[PDB]
Amino acid sequence: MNVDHEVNLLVEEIHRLGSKNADGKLSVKFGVLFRDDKSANLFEALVGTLKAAKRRKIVTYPGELLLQGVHDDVDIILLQDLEHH
Template sequence: MNVDHEVKLLVKEIQRLGTKDADGQTTVTFGVLFNDDQCANIFEALVGTLKAAKKRKVVKYESELLLQGVHDNVQIVLLQE
């Protein structure tokens, strides 16, 4: 699949699952994304898609590598709606 296409799908899923913070940005935790059935069906490699989106400055999060369980509470912030 095309990486840009996957990043666009990721943006839609973050908008669907996330909430607006005080700054008006949409945020979601990694655990919510990882454990969502629809996301599991869309993304073969969610962590890879998140990394590509971070590199393109579409999302931001604090951790370098996201691991299920350990990083479930890491906030992913959508920078481009």
């Protein structure tokens, strides 16, 4: 409910759903994550959660705003990793 937790929830989910790109970092396509969220609704505000982590430079993804699933091929790239002990 507090987006502060959701950010870390996001990076964990990305750790499981995401696959490594050429840069060696984990990345997951919006369509894949959105697909899972459409079932459980983990992120009540997925876009806002993405924004939060993009502002923290934890993840990056092409696009500013979106409404339709035309950005589903957009890979959310994990730039900063704090998820794992």
